[PDB]
Amino acid sequence: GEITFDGIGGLTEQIRELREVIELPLKNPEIFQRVGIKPPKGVLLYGPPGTGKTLLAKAVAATIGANFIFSPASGIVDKYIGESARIIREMFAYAKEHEPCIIFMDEVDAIGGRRFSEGTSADREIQRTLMELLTQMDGFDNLGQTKIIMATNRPDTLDPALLRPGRLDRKVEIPLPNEAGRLEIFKIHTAKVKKTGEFDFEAAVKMSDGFNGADIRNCATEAGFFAIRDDRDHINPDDLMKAVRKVAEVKK
Amino acid sequence: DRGVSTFSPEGRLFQVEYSLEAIKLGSTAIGIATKEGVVLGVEKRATSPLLESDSIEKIVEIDRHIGCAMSGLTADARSMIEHARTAAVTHNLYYDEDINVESLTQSVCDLALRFGEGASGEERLMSRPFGVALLIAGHDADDGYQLFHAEPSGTFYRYNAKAIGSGSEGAQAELLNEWHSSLTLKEAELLVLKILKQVMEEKLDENNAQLSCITKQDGFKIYDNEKTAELIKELKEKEAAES
Amino acid sequence: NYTGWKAISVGANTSAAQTLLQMDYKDDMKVDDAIELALKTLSKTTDSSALT
Amino acid sequence: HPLQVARCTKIIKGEDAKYVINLKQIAKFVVGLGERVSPTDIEEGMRVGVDRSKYNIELPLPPRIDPSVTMMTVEEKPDVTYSDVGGCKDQIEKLREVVELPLLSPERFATLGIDPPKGILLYGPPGTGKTLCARAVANRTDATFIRVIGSELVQKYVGEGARMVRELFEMARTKKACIIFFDEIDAVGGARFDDGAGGDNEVQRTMLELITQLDGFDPRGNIKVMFATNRPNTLDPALLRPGRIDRKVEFSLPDLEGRANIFRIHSKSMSVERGIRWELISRLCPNSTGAELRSVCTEAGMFAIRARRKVATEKDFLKAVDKVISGYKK
Amino acid sequence: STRVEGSGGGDSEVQRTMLELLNQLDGFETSKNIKIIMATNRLDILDPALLRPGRIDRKIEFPPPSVAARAEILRIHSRKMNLTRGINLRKVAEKMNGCSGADVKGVCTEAGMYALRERRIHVTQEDFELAVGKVMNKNQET
Amino acid sequence: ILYGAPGTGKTLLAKAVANQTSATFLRIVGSELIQKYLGDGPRLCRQIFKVAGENAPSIVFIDEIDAIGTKRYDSNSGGEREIQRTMLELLNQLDGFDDRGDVKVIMATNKIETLDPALIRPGRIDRKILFENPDLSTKKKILGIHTSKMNLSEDVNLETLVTTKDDLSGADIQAMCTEAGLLALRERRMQVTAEDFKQAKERVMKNKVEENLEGLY
Amino acid sequence: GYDRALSIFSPDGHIFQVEYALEAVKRGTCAVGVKGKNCVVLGCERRSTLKLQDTRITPSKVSKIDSHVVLSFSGLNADSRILIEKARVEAQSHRLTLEDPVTVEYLTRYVAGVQQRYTQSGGVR
Amino acid sequence: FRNNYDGDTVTFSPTGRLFQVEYALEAIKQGSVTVGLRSNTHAVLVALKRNADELSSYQKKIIKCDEHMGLSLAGLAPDARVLSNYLRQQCNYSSLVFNRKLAVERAGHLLCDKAQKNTQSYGGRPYGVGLLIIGYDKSGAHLLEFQPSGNVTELYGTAIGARSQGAKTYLERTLDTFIKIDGNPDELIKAGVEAISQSLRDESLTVDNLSIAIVGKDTPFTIYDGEAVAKYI
Amino acid sequence: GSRRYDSRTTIFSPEGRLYQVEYALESISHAGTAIGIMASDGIVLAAERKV
Amino acid sequence: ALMYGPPGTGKTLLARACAAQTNATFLKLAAPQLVQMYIGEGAKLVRDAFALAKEKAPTIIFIDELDAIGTKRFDSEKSGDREVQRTMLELLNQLDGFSSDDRVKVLAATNRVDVLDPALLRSGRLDRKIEFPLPSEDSRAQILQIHSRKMTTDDDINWQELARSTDEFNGAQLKAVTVEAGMIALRNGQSSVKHEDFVEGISEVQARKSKSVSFYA
């Protein structure tokens, strides 16, 4: 993964409950076999992209040492016989060969979703794609060292078959962090950036409400424009305040 | 379709322009004003050999010294003709004297705008303005003989000649050269018909034309058909002897 | 639009009922002869085991 | 020597001694990396050459001289000067300012600082008066009119297409003080979603070649390029942008006065009475393109034989209008 | 039975192709006793020119079934079946409403399934009534 | 241009006239060229015109140009570029050919606002011939020919048959004759009554006139 | 609302509602009037293939407006009844105010005004 | 897009101009040009009467509305008529009731409200007409510019109708001369005929169908027509 | 706006009768039957009850 | 970086002007060419740009328009408009992968921006929002001053006047006007441009000046 799973910290609740669903059956399939319950099947990330959404998906894969495999859903839309069948199967086959692996399927409303009404207008290409996903999961085939992860802007948009257990058992939500949560994420973010002793973490956290990892990252870079401007090689309280107020202004 | 508040770029509603197009598809009406008379000719038009003459209106009396010629739809001019008679009658009751050509025209054209569910001290309630233009002629003691062109768009121009129709092109250009300050009433009628036969593609006759004039000698007089035929017959000789 | 008729049907199954009516019609029928007639026509437009 | 693909069927030696250019998708033979110095030769087989597209190999023996790489119709100092050009006044005035006056005085435009329009795009009913109007201005300045048919530029062979475009612009520079009239530009294609739909590769080669030649090194002061289009909204972005297309001209329909004149011009061939007036037919005629006026004229004669006379009266002209204009239903 | 709900351009384009052949045959060949059977029950998206003589020369209407007919179709099919004696087939048919020829075939195979479930080779009138009611529900769907 | 429905209007007049002029009748089905690959419509149009010039006198019949006859308003957003290309190649050859009596072109189509105003080309296509349902007299003639071929009763008249007709196509009259003979052959006999033709007429008319509208009010 | 754009000109100068009106007339029955010079004959079609109705419960083609004024129509039944009611009110009002048995032309002027009226101005079709 | 802010009188823009206001501003220009200039004791309107047909006869297009008031139009003539109609009525009601003679500012305000009520229903409409109103009251001389957009400014000088910018630039320059010249008509009138000739650039100037209108301390409302404009060309 | 949220369907079809009126007729043909018989010693009315 | 506000203000020229100055490769991708009716195609085009961007480095990937592909929906009806959604998404996914880098620059222009997301406010993506509001009067006189620099002049031009009379006019509109001002000067006999020529360019129609003697006699 691009980053480890304790360096994005201040998403910690979501870190915690992704870690025990995904990492543990991959590392230790044995505990789930021994109990006699199924290993987990599918996990869902929902919420706006870049709320630290992308972080959490990259980050679970790093710790396992899985390969993260990004699949564009539209490309799964070939207009030939069984090409569409072929592509899904091959990812599933490769997931078992190169195990452990995360097959990350981004957007499940270019190959799934609930459509216009699920009639025929060119909504059968979409229907063929979803049918394939549903048949492998429900059937004799299964997910064990292939984990599949769905991503969707809002979860209510997904077929209720996908909403059943035996497709997706784990459904994680990504909200706006806590003030405590913002605080932990900022200290991490500002740490790796070189700065003067006179920097005030305390001031920025107080000004920030409704900030995701991305919004903290903007405050560092915005300050940095003022810091080339003020003829320095390091970030200072003067650069920090201005930057924090501007990122606040542009948004709610 | 089209709103009663939806303009073109120039300030002008769709509906107003569109009326003005249908006007031009009517029948040809030509009026020439001098200071010896105003002569009005129209093509009456026979729509069949079994359509009776003088049952179709093209020369109407607003008052006994005041006429109008129409072009467009004939029913649409009826609401105007009604308003014009009423205006004339009322002014004479109140003031015991004649309405001026201008005054009369203004009164009809104020109520030809309208349309929509609007109001501002003017009652507007029409679905469309009228589809018809009329050439309103009269003589008044002060200004004598005058001719006015009424647009149903609430617009009014004072004129000394105007022609409208589908024959407008030939007739206005001919009218400019033919215009003079005074010339005899008999020469003028003969000359009007000459202009009409030119823009007309077919033989001109009295079963599709009616003439009319306005005199200070005896007020609004429709120059009737029998008398008009004898002039058309002279027309055939004078015209094939310039050729 | 309105018309007068000597036998007509309206609502569903106008064609079927009207066709039969024109055929059995008479002008020496009595109330009871009509009822019998009426009851036949109604039967032939309704498909059932029985009509109650 | 035409060759657009050149097998020599396993003449074998070897370093080298096969020296065969195949340009075909199946089999890509590249003899690249600059020079091979040869007196005459790639290899043998009646077919020393380097196809229509060259994988290096700097041109032994004539392979890209091919019999028709031109087929368009040039008319210097056109026949047309006034044909269907009546009541085209707004269109005609634009052509005068854009084309006529810089040709007439190149020095005045230079001194001012401005460029006359590099390109003109002409839309509206096409060839009904459009091509005619273009020929009328050209004749007046004595400027070669070059009429190129969009559809021909659609040859089904390799480059065959890039061949033709190139020689058309070479001709324009030689004969300069001249108009290149392109009827269709959607025959050789503009914007579409059908490049991924697996065929229109041949089309794409032509399109790109065209853009390159024009903007690249064609002088655009006297040499005018005129484009004609059937859908004004289907231009490719390269085509659209200023520096290539400036002036966008409307087709102008013959007006009442204009239609009467065109009526006189076309009846000079016909055998009809001259005592009638053209004007009369025009009042009954509603807004009609130059093509329709011509259609009235052939129809009055068919009417005339039907009514059993060998002259056409006014009355045949009136009937002939009634028939063509209802029939047309546009 | 081979429903597909016509088409405006997927089987109107194909019928045009068919229509040339039929035209060519009426000409020089003059070939008849070579037959095409079409059947369809919609023509508000199918072309009329097929129904014109040259291609389709006769247009015959299918009759609607009746209670009296449903009883016959049942009578033939049950003849292979082992029955319990005292049975009355007109009664079973009358209990049908709307039922087309394929539905009648369903009544025997379901009557028999009910008997099979109870491990009987003989089927009473009562099972047959219960079967028809099931068959009626099938026609009501979609 | 021949407008109407084929087999009864468009097809009959075009076959008939060619036979009269002793010219080669060429029917091409427009839609079928409607091939689904970019580029091959334009080849196919070329071959039509190539054959014509080689093998004149000819009547070129292009049936149903409304699949390749499109001309759209776009080529983006579900726009298909081939369809428009083919329509243009077709048009440019047609306008390239002009004759006084080597080629006359007959078209079939039922919309003209899918076609280019330069594929009409005013001064080429002057004529607009359209099928209607025939007059009483012409209907009399259509009946008269078809009954020649029958053996029939003498209670049958042309006159009686006309009065109950509301103006129909000639194809309905043909269809009526085949249906009628079939009730006569079913009754095992070769006499066709006035009643037989009347039953047959009513029946086809009924199958065609699936839409209905009260017009008397 | 419904006080506007029922009726407006095209830029082609056709009226929608009038153009679809003339079409109801062609579809409907047939009426003709031929004049002598000391008579007027009015002949009418009433067309029904269905024979299960009488003339004495199907409305007449010629309706009396007065004993010496008659009205014939072709078109919708519904609409024609509206027009007929005005013409009888106009006959009796004229007789009352001018004290002359009716002139037939004046009655045309009243029926024709109504017809103009709902076209020119909205709130009625 | 177009259809959002066109015909819809209830809508707004972040800018506050709808399509219906920009068309109205264009409509003013399509009437003939008329220029205004005033001192502090007189107010002048110089207006060109140019016929729009060959046969058409010249008629007044400056209309005296009261003894101490008038207007000239530029733009749409029906639109101009209704407003003039309401203003003549308004003039009377003030004179009978309150004996009040209107200042321009007051009328103006009234004028804005009238347009405003008709831009609050789809069945009414906005106008297409500008007006220059002159009047002389006891606060001196006045010239007002009325706009359909409801922007009313009382100015020393302006022009509306086609090709305004010729005259505006001249009028801003001769400003200082003209405003301090009091009790003398002839110079301000002459200067108005010069202004309007810079508006024209390619359109005729008529030496007997110009019409100049003046109001003031020593001038009750007179329109000089025909002959009587001669000595100011 | 809301001057274009008018259904405009109580205007004529080209078929010689209003849209809404023709469509409404269909609605009748999908509801209960009434039968009217006029006799020479009565009038008989029958109607079949819907549900 | 992200650019927004009306085109023809000189956005496209600034993109190139920045490219020339830094010594970057201008790669122009028109957003409606990427929008294929065929499966998955635009997505592939978006990826091919970025890859070549890295070999060709330093580079500005200039995407003229981002309003055609900006549409991505929020409903379940996304199925249909999948193609536009994937391309927008594809560019953000690839961009975010790195962040120590700036040897590919992405520049987007939007007619006006309509959506905003955390995706569209992150560093290494579109952090930067530069707005292009319509230019001022003072600004128009300088842009005008540039066009007439190429022109030859009589030094009778007054810039100030013309600039106050134009109303939210853009760089493109002004350029065309300078060419019309020169044509007028040709017509008058002049071979140089003065102020009046420009004033006359303003008088011809632009939706606020017009000439006629209509509705006036």
Give a three-class secondary structure readout of chain B: CCCCCCECCCCCEHHHHHHHHHHHHCCCEEEEECCCCEEEEECCCCCCCCCCCCCCCCEEEEECCEEEEEEECCCHHHHHHHHHHHHHHHHHHHHCCCCCHHHHHHHHHCCCCCCCCCECCCECCECCCCCEEEEEEEEECCCEEEEEEECCCCCEEEECEEEECCCHHHHHHHHHHHCCCCCCHHHHHHHHHHHHHHHCCCCCCCCCCEEEEEECCCEEECCCHHHHHHHHHHHHHHHCCCC
**Shortest alpha-carbon distance between residue C49 and chain E (Å):** 6
Name chain D contacts of F117, Cβ cutoff 8 Å. 125, 128, 289, 291, 330
- In the chain, the amino acid numbered F195 is E
Cis ω for the linkage preceding H14 (within 30 of 0):
no
E20, E43, E52 ranked by CB distance to F27: nearest: E20
Question: In this structure, what token pair is assigned to residue D34?
Answer: 């600059």
Distance of CA A74 to CAs A48, A77, F77, J83, Å?
20, 5, 18, 7
Q: Is J17 within 8 Å of J66 (Cβ atoms)?
A: no
Provide the Cα torsion D13, D14, D18, D24; round to 10°: 130
- Name all contacts of I23-28 with Cβ < 8 Å and 24+ positions apart: I28/C10, I28/C11
Closest CA to D130 of F118, G89, H7, C47: F118
**Shortest alpha-carbon distance between residue J134 and chain D (Å):** 21
Q: What helix, strand, coil percent values describe chain C, rounded to 5?
A: 50, 10, 45
Q: Which residue range is the domain that position B68 belongs to?
A: 1-242
Work out the burial of residue J75: count CB atoms within 10 Å of its CB; fewer than 13 is exposed, 13-18 middle, 19 or more buried.
Answer: middle
Question: In this structure, what token pair is assigned to residue H129?
Answer: 């007409």
Tell the residue number behind the tokens 């899918």, with chain if given: F114
Please tell me the total number of residues recorded for chain A in this structure: 252
Interchain touch B–A (≥3 Cβ pairs closer than 8 Å):
no
The H or E element spanning position A147 is strand A146-152
Are I35 and C12 an interchain contact pair (Cβ–Cβ within 8 Å)? no
Q: What experiment produced this structure? A: cryo-EM
F79, F89, F126 ranked by CB distance to D298: nearest: F126
Cα distance between residue E54 and residue D200, in whole Å: 42
B4, B10, B154 ranked by CB distance to H26: nearest: B10
Q: Is D137 within 8 Å of D96 (Cβ atoms)?
A: yes
Q: Is D42 within 8 Å of D50 (Cβ atoms)?
A: yes
Q: What is the DSSP letter of J8?
A: T
R_g of chain D, CA atoms, integer Å: 26
Domain residue ranges of chain H, discontinuous segments joined by + = 3-233
CB within 8 Å of chain J, chain H residues 151-170: 162-163, 165, 169
Q: CA nearest B158 in J: which residue?
A: J217
F38, F73, F112 ranked by CB distance to D329: nearest: F112
The H or E element spanning position F208 is helix F194-208
Question: In this structure, what token pair is assigned to residue B216?
Answer: 């200070």
Q: CA nearest H9 in I: which residue?
A: I1
Resolution in A: 8.8
| Binding-site sequence positions of A | 47-54
Cα distance between residue D259 and residue D254, in whole Å: 6
Distance of CA G124 to CAs G25, G87, G120, Å?
20, 19, 10
Closest CA to F65 of F38, F103, F94, F32: F32
Q: CA nearest J75 in A: which residue?
A: A157
CB-defined contacts F:G, below 8 A: 14
Name chain C contacts of E67, Cβ cutoff 8 Å. 47
Tell whether F74 is within 8 A of chain J (Cβ).
no
Tell whether G78 is within 8 A of chain C (Cβ).
yes
Tell whether F16 is within 8 A of chain I (Cβ).
no
Tell whether B6 is within 8 A of chain H (Cβ).
yes
Cα distance between residue H24 and residue B220, in whole Å: 43
Closest CA to D196 of J38, J44, A78: J38
Closest CA to J134 of J5, J25, J35: J5
Chain B touching partners, 3 or more CB pairs below 8 A: D, G, H, I, J
The three-class DSSP label of residue H183 is: coil
Q: CA nearest D110 in J: which residue?
A: J191
Instruction: Tell me if D248 is assigned to a ligand binding site.
Output: no
- When divided into structural domains, chain B yields a total of 1
Closest CA to B13 of B113, B122, B150: B113
CB-defined contacts B:D, below 8 A: 17
**Shortest alpha-carbon distance between residue F140 and chain D (Å):** 27
- In the chain, the amino acid numbered D108 is R
Q: What is the DSSP letter of J60?
A: E
Cα distance between residue F213 and residue F217, in whole Å: 10
Distance of CA A173 to CAs A46, B163, D317, Å?
6, 80, 81
**Shortest alpha-carbon distance between residue D148 and chain F (Å):** 12
Closest CA to B130 of B96, B61, B81, B92: B81
Cα distance between residue D165 and residue D178, in whole Å: 16
Q: What helix, strand, coil percent values describe chain D, rounded to 5?
A: 40, 10, 55
Please enumerate in sequence order all residues whose Cβ is within 8 A of that of E4, keeping only pairs 6 or more positions apart, or say none.
E11
Q: Is J174 within 8 Å of J10 (Cβ atoms)?
A: no
Q: Is D47 within 8 Å of D71 (Cβ atoms)?
A: no
**Does the domain formed by H3-233 have CATH 3.60.20.10?**
yes
Strand partners, J25: J59
| Binding-site sequence positions of A for ATP | 47-54
Tell whether C7 is within 8 A of chain G (Cβ).
yes
Instruction: Tell me if D63 is assigned to a ligand binding site.
Output: no
E strand residue ranges, chain C? 7-10
**Shortest alpha-carbon distance between residue F79 and chain J (Å):** 9
Name chain H contacts of I2, Cβ cutoff 8 Å. 122
Strand partners, H191: none
Cα distance between residue B59 and residue B30, in whole Å: 12
D242: number of Cβ within 10 Å: 12
CB within 8 Å of chain G, chain F residues 106-165: none
Cα distance between residue B110 and residue B102, in whole Å: 12
Please enumerate in sequence order all residues whose Cβ is within 8 A of that of G13, keeping only pairs 6 or more positions apart, or say none.
B18, B21, B22, B25, B131
Q: CA nearest I5 in B: which residue?
A: B1
Angle (nearest 5°) at CA E126 between E123 and E131: 85
The H or E element spanning position C35 is helix C31-44
Please tell me the total number of residues recorded for chain C in this structure: 52
Question: In this structure, what token pair is assigned to residue H184?
Answer: 């003398």
**Shortest alpha-carbon distance between residue G110 and chain B (Å):** 12
In sign, the C-alpha dihedral spanning J145, J146, J151, J155 is: positive
Instruction: Tell me if F70 is assigned to a ligand binding site.
Output: no
Cα distance between residue H91 and residue H113, in whole Å: 16
G107: number of Cβ within 10 Å: 20
The three-class DSSP label of residue A34 is: helix
Tell the residue number behind the tokens 């961009």, with chain if given: J95
Cα distance between residue H171 and residue H158, in whole Å: 7
Query: Which CATH number belongs to the domain containing residue B28 in this structure?
Result: 3.60.20.10
Cα distance between residue H176 and residue H179, in whole Å: 6
I19: number of Cβ within 10 Å: 15
Residue G34, phi then psi, degrees to nearest 5 = -135, 140
Q: What is the DSSP letter of H3?
A: G
Please tell me the total number of residues recorded for chain J in this structure: 217
Question: In this structure, what token pair is assigned to residue F210?
Answer: 């699936």
The H or E element spanning position E110 is helix E101-117
Interface test with D, best of J179, J193, J194 (most D CBs within 10 A): J179
What is the CB-side half-sphere exposure of residue D292 using CA atoms within 13 A? 25
The H or E element spanning position G89 is helix G77-98
Strand partners, B146: B138
In sign, the C-alpha dihedral spanning H162, H164, H165, H166 is: positive
Question: In this structure, what token pair is assigned to residue J80?
Answer: 């249909």
Interface test with I, best of F211, F212, F214 (most I CBs within 10 A): F214
Cα distance between residue B92 and residue B96, in whole Å: 5
Are D330 and F117 an interchain contact pair (Cβ–Cβ within 8 Å)? yes
Which ranges of chain D would DSSP assign to H, the alpha helix? 89-95, 101-104, 106-112, 130-141, 160-174, 201-217, 237-240, 256-267, 279-284, 290-306, 314-328
Name chain I contacts of B4, Cβ cutoff 8 Å. 3
Q: CA nearest C5 in I: which residue?
A: I38
Distance of CA A144 to CAs A35, A58, A94, A105, D79, Å?
15, 19, 13, 17, 83
Which ranges of chain J would DSSP assign to H, the alpha helix? 11-22, 31-34, 41-55, 82-96, 137-150, 159-165, 171-188, 195-203
Cα distance between residue B56 and residue D190, in whole Å: 59
B15, B21, B78 ranked by CB distance to G8: nearest: B15
Cα distance between residue B78 and residue H93, in whole Å: 35
E strand residue ranges, chain H? 34-38, 42-48, 62-66, 69-75, 129-137, 140-146, 153-154, 157-160, 210-216, 222-225
Tell the residue number behind the tokens 């007639």, with chain if given: C37
Distance of CA H156 to CAs E25, H179, I22, Å?
94, 8, 68
- Angle, in degrees to the nearest 10, between helices B76-95 and B101-109: 130
The H or E element spanning position I36 is strand I34-38
Cα distance between residue I15 and residue I34, in whole Å: 28
Q: Is G61 within 8 Å of G80 (Cβ atoms)?
A: no
B6, B116, B154 ranked by CB distance to H81: nearest: B154
CB within 8 Å of chain C, chain G residues 36-55: 50-54
Tell whether H102 is within 8 A of chain J (Cβ).
no
Cα distance between residue A215 and residue A62, in whole Å: 24
The three-class DSSP label of residue D209 is: helix
Work out the burial of residue A54: count CB atoms within 10 Å of its CB; fewer than 13 is exposed, 13-18 middle, 19 or more buried.
Answer: buried
R_g of chain E, CA atoms, integer Å: 22
Strand partners, J137: none
Are B158 and J207 an interchain contact pair (Cβ–Cβ within 8 Å)? no
Q: Is G77 within 8 Å of G59 (Cβ atoms)?
A: yes
Strand J129-131 vs strand B59-63: parallel, antiparallel, or unpaired? unpaired
The H or E element spanning position J64 is strand J59-64
Closest CA to G31 of G66, G71, G83: G71
**Shortest alpha-carbon distance between residue B10 and chain J (Å):** 9
Q: CA nearest I13 in G: which residue?
A: G20
Tell whether E38 is within 8 A of chain C (Cβ).
no
Checking phi first, is residue F48 left (phi over 0); if not, alpha (psi -120 to 50) or beta?
alpha
Chain A touching partners, 3 or more CB pairs below 8 A: J
Closest CA to B42 of B157, B215, B212, B216: B212
Q: Is A219 within 8 Å of A204 (Cβ atoms)?
A: yes
Work out the burial of residue A191: count CB atoms within 10 Å of its CB; fewer than 13 is exposed, 13-18 middle, 19 or more buried.
Answer: exposed
Question: In this structure, what token pair is assigned to residue H226?
Answer: 């025909």
Name chain G contacts of C8, Cβ cutoff 8 Å. 52
The H or E element spanning position G64 is strand G63-66
J40, J92, J117 ranked by CB distance to A75: nearest: J40
Instruction: Tell me if D124 is assigned to a ligand binding site.
Output: yes
Q: Is A235 within 8 Å of A223 (Cβ atoms)?
A: yes
DSSP-derived secondary structure for A67-109? EEEEEEGGGG---STTHHHHHHHHHHHHHHHT-SEEEEEE-SS
- Name all contacts of D99-108 with Cβ < 8 Å and 24+ positions apart: D99/D137, D99/D138, D99/D141, D99/D143, D99/D179, D99/D224, D100/D137, D100/D140, D100/D141, D101/J186, D102/D221, D102/D222, D103/D141, D103/D143, D103/D177, D103/D222, D104/D141, D106/D221, D106/D222, D108/J186, D108/J191
Question: In this structure, what token pair is assigned to residue J15?
Answer: 């993109």
Q: What is the DSSP letter of H228?
A: G
Q: Is H112 within 8 Å of H150 (Cβ atoms)?
A: yes
- In the chain, the amino acid numbered G48 is S
Cα distance between residue H36 and residue H33, in whole Å: 10
Work out the burial of residue H121: count CB atoms within 10 Å of its CB; fewer than 13 is exposed, 13-18 middle, 19 or more buried.
Answer: middle
Q: Is I2 within 8 Å of G1 (Cβ atoms)?
A: no
Checking phi first, is residue F130 left (phi over 0); if not, alpha (psi -120 to 50) or beta?
beta
Name chain B contacts of I3, Cβ cutoff 8 Å. 3-4
Cα distance between residue J60 and residue J17, in whole Å: 11
Work out the burial of residue J63: count CB atoms within 10 Å of its CB; fewer than 13 is exposed, 13-18 middle, 19 or more buried.
Answer: buried
Angle (nearest 5°) at CA B106 between B100 and B110: 155
